[PDB]
């Protein structure tokens, strides 16, 4: 059985939400109640087969190249991008329940702010913050995620994905949305991705994709519809990326030590 | 403060408890340190395997008792420990694999890399049933004497003159060395393939990325047949 | 001046590449490189004083 | 004379290091940023001649 | 903010490798070309009082450490990692050592496990003997005993029925023997008796192993010698004894031979598979050691002091029986040592 | 002060010394046989 | 006894007891040092081979 994680001071989460983006209900549907919609509907695709002893995060691995487990596949996406994204957005990750802490000051690290100048041309923290709000705006029209990841190349890029788009394995990050009409440029990305995974001699033909996310933001409407409400999904991203939590988002660059 | 005498092995009951011991050892190592990637270069078949013998294994690992596929069995936990990644190992690894590396620096080796003389030539011995041959080869245009005489006049058969050639005709050199040949002892046909094998070992000074070619036609293989009293 | 003029020739050869750490930096990390190649040889003459003595007094 | 100047400089400080642990080939004259000198070649080049004709 | 540091290293790392590299190009320059123009060089110079202090003081440095030195004497975690450069990409180790970040934090996000049987946890985090039921123990197939057509008639009393061509070993009677054999492997232990665990089929040396090294004990997984016990001086005299304290410690007293020969007898003889072991049981029964085993429907009861009933033939039944035991002789073990302390 | 071992002992466990040849005139011929 | 010696002369080398005759000659040192420990009272009596009787076959005819 997969159960919700208990969160850091719980307590205060469920009083007064999560500071300065989701008030208590807002936050009681996001991961209260989505987390435990999300936990129960995969025990249920799960439970009595081989994947109900893996963690979400191995069971989309291991299924992301097998077309009829697509809902499995997208309730443990759901599950470990939605972890991934509370993770970030809380106000701290210790428990100072009992020790009362309401100083939290965390700001990027000298490793984050070198990498992006680095993988952005000289652009700024701030600017780069104004690309991801456009690009969820404008490549997002409905349900799926945000992401800031990190490839085998040092470098920091942003990705979106549609509905539930793993960052991890690119055959299935769902960045380009075919409902609607596509250019020739996206084309040959698509084309050239089914090359790639055609060169696989695997008999499960599985890639090798060493990109890892950074920074997550849920852009579902059951994070943003209750306290923003439809049409001011941008005033949410804005307040999520001026309130991460840079503690855990710098322990997900590695460094090397 | 009671004191009592225990077995000190935990494989005490076994078969044979000292070997029994050393695989569990490198067994909690491959255990502990089972997701370190392994070398990709083992694909390129690094050279590198100095392992105790099973005699100097004997003396640690039961003795009589040892068996050759419990030797076997150390052997293939010895490498797969070994060909961790260089840079992902570990002290404790390296130090568990020192105890079956083999010794032998104390003494040196005897071989001295061999090199034309003052005056550019080759100088090697080559010997066939009782006949012995000392050949001087140096950059020329072919000229080849045998004991002060023509080559034509010294061996009358041409089969003995084609042997002589043969060294010089693998490496395709045959207009590019002067050889000065003495020869002593059996016959025609001993001296010219002792003068033979001794060409091919005074050709590999001048080029020694030759003599695979070399040993590959047989030229460097000193042929031991020799008369046998009747037995 | 050999002791000091084959040095300063050393340098005058990885000058050519060169084409101030050299005057403290490279000068230090030269005088221990060549430590290293005179310990080099003490230790393959030691070698074959030993080979040249009974290093086996008693059987072999 | 600045290059006896900064070659006295380069042996006395050497000198100090050496001094301030016992001396061993293998780590007092470890390379730079390395633990000791494993003391573990005459593998000639062949020359541009002696390879074309191998090829 | 403190790169440079390492930046200060590099540049000496590079500069060593360019001095280095020269250094064999002068090794293959001929003397002729290189030493006579050198020597004329200082034919044609004078010495200075400055050139002349590192005449006498390279000459000291290189008298002090190259000569007469002495040439031999008589960041922990991947220390040996070769660190990319910034502008380059990940190498192949640093990607692993970034995947095993990943699996620390990140891997495990989302969703906890409960309520699910995990192979080695039967092993490394058995339960204690009173924390067990009928649920557990059938969780683990202990009841399921031989087919019907191999039934020995003597276990009669150790049946609960016969279910799908097999007859059903009766837990209830499992849990009163399984309690009664735990408490005799916690008594030697506590004792500081010599616990053998004895099981040959393929699968159970890893319990056998970790039984053993929770209960300071003994292990036998490849071949029953016959004659171990009954023949011990044939067998086992060869092997190296040693004296301990009460407390386990190696006293290191050297041995008299006397006392290096005699026989070492195990105070306590646990068998996994007792139908494939009868040369050790009977070694027991002659040499008047006390046994348990795991005693299936096909399996003679009366052969051992303390019996078992349970399936012998499923490991995760073994070595659920078997934790439990020595789990049993773990608490011995730290209640002696505890009464030494105090 | 250990023992002085003067030269004479240590010769014996040494190799033989030989004196240089100055003339070259040859005196005498000492050939030894044994069947070992 | 072979490790001894080796020992006592790894040691008189290492201790140093002209360069160039430092590549030519063979002299590790002093008699004394090179055989230290070595004596009549240790070395001979356990060398010695063919010392113990360990078998016998009488036959008659
Ligand atoms: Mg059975």
């Not at chain 2, 009782?130 to 006049?153: M, W, Y």
């Not at chain 5, 490394?124 to 197939?141: C, D, H, K, Q």
């Not at chain 7, 113990?52 to 076959?57: A, K, Q």
Request: hydrophobic content about 35%.
């Amino acid at each position: 059985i997969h159960v919700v994680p208990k969160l850091p001071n719980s307590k205060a989460l469920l009083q007064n939400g999560v500071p300065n983006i989701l008030s208590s209900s807002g936050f009681k549907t996001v991961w209260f109640d989505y987390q435990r919609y999300l936990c129960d509907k995969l025990t249920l695709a799960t439970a009595g087969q081989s994947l109900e002893s893996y963690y979400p995060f191995h069971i989309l691995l291991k299924t992301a190249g097998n077309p009829l487990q697509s809902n499995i596949f997208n309730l443990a996406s759901s599950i470990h991008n939605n972890h991934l994204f509370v993770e970030n957005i809380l106000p701290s990750a210790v428990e100072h329940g009992t020790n009362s802490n309401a100083v939290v000051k965390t700001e990027p690290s000298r490793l984050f702010l070198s990498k992006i100048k680095d993988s952005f041309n000289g652009s700024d923290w701030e600017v780069v913050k104004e690309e991801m709000i456009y690009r969820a705006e404008n490549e997002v029209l409905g349900q799926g995620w945000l992401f800031l990841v990190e490839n085998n190349e040092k470098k920091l890029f942003i990705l979106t994905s549609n509905n539930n788009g793993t960052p991890y394995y690119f055959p299935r990050n769902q960045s380009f949305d075919l409902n609607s009409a596509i250019s020739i440029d996206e084309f040959a990305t698509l084309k050239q991705m089914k090359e790639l995974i055609g060169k696989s001699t695997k008999l499960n033909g599985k890639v090798q994709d060493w990109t890892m996310p950074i920074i997550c933001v849920n852009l579902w409407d059951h994070a943003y519809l209750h306290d923003y409400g439809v049409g001011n999904r941008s005033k949410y991203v804005k307040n999520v990326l001026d309130n991460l939590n840079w503690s855990v988002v710098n322990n997900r660059i590695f460094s090397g030590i | 403060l009671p004191r009592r005498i225990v077995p000190k092995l935990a494989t005490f009951y076994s078969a044979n408890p000292n070997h029994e011991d050393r695989i569990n050892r490198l067994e909690r190592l491959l255990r502990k340190y089972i997701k370190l990637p392994s070398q990709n270069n083992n694909e390129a078949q690094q050279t590198k395997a100095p392992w105790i013998s099973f005699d100097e294994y004997a003396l640690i690992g039961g003795g009589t008792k040892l068996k050759p596929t419990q030797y076997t069995q150390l052997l293939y936990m010895l490498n797969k420990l070994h060909n961790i990644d260089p840079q992902l190992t570990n002290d404790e690894i390296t130090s568990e694999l020192s105890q079956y590396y083999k010794k032998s620096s104390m003494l040196s080796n005897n071989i001295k890399i061999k090199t034309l003389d003052e005056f550019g030539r080759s100088i090697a011995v080559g010997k066939r049933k009782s006949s012995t041959a000392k050949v001087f080869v140096v950059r020329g245009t072919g000229e080849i004497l045998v004991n002060g005489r023509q080559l034509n006049d010294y061996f009358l058969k041409m089969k003995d003159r084609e042997s002589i050639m043969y060294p010089l005709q693998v490496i395709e050199s045959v207009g590019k060395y002067n050889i000065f040949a003495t020869t002593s002892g059996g016959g025609p046909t001993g001296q010219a393939e002792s003068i033979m094998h001794a060409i091919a070992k005074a050709l590999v000074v001048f080029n020694p990325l030759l003599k695979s070619r070399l040993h590959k036609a047989g030229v460097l293989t000193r042929d031991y047949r020799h008369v046998e009293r009747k037995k | 001046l050999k002791l000091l003029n084959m040095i300063l020739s050393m340098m005058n050869k990885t000058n050519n590449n060169n084409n101030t750490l050299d005057s403290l930096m490279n000068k230090k990390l030269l005088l221990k490189n060549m430590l290293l190649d005179m310990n080099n040889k003490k230790m393959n003459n030691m070698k074959r004083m030993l080979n040249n003595n009974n290093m086996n007094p008693a059987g072999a | 004379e600045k290059g006896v100047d900064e070659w006295l400089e380069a042996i006395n400080e050497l000198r100090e290091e050496f001094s301030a642990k016992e001396y061993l080939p293998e780590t007092s004259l470890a390379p730079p940023g390395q633990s000791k000198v494993d003391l573990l070649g005459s593998k000639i080049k062949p020359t541009a001649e002696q390879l074309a004709q191998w090829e | 903010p403190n790169n440079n540091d390492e930046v200060m290293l590099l540049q000496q790392k590079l500069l060593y490798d360019e001095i280095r590299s020269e250094l064999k190009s002068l090794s293959q320059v001929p003397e002729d070309e290189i030493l006579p123009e050198l020597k004329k060089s200082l034919e044609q110079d004078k010495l200075s009082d400055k050139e002349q202090q590192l005449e006498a003081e390279l000459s000291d440095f290189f008298r002090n450490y190259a000569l007469l030195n002495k040439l031999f004497d008589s960041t922990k975690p991947y220390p040996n990692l070769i660190p990319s450069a910034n502008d380059k990409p990940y190498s192949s180790q640093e990607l692993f050592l970034r995947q095993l970040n990943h699996s620390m934090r990140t891997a495990k996000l989302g969703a906890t496990i409960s309520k699910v049987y995990y192979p080695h946890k039967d092993i490394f985090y058995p339960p204690l003997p009173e924390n067990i039921t009928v649920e557990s123990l059938m969780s683990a197939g202990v009841h399921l005993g031989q087919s019907t057509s191999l039934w020995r008639s003597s276990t009669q009393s150790y049946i609960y029925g016969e279910y799908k061509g097999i007859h059903i070993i009766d837990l209830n009677q499992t849990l009163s023997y399984l309690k009664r054999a735990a408490k005799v492997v916690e008594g030697v232990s506590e004792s500081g008796g010599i616990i053998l665990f004895l099981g040959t089929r393929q699968g159970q040396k890893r319990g056998l192993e970790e039984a053993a090294k929770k209960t300071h004990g003994y292990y036998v997984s490849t071949r029953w010698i016959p004659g171990t016990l009954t023949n011990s001086t044939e067998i086992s005299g060869i092997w190296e004894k040693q004296e301990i304290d009460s407390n386990d410690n190696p006293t290191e007293r050297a041995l008299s031979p006397n006392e290096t020969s005699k026989q070492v007898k195990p105070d306590l003889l646990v068998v996994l598979n007792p139908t494939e072991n009868r040369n050790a049981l009977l070694e027991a029964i002659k040499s008047r050691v006390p046994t348990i085993a795991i005693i299936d429907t096909d399996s003679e009861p009366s052969l051992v002091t303390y019996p078992i009933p349970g399936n012998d033939d499923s490991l995760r039944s073994v070595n659920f029986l078997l934790g439990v035991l020595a789990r049993a002789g773990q608490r011995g073990l730290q209640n002696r040592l505890a009464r030494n302390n105090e | 002060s250990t023992r002085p071992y003067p030269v004479n002992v240590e010769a014996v466990y040494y190799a033989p010394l030989k004196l240089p040849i100055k003339y070259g005139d040859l005196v005498a011929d000492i050939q030894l046989r044994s069947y070992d | 006894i072979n490790n001894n010696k080796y020992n006592n002369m790894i040691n008189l080398l290492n201790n140093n007891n002209n360069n160039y005759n430092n590549n030519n000659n063979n002299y590790i040192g002093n008699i004394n040092n090179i055989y230290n420990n070595m004596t009549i009272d240790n070395i001979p009596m356990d060398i010695l081979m063919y010392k113990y009787l360990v078998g016998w076959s009488i036959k008659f005819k």
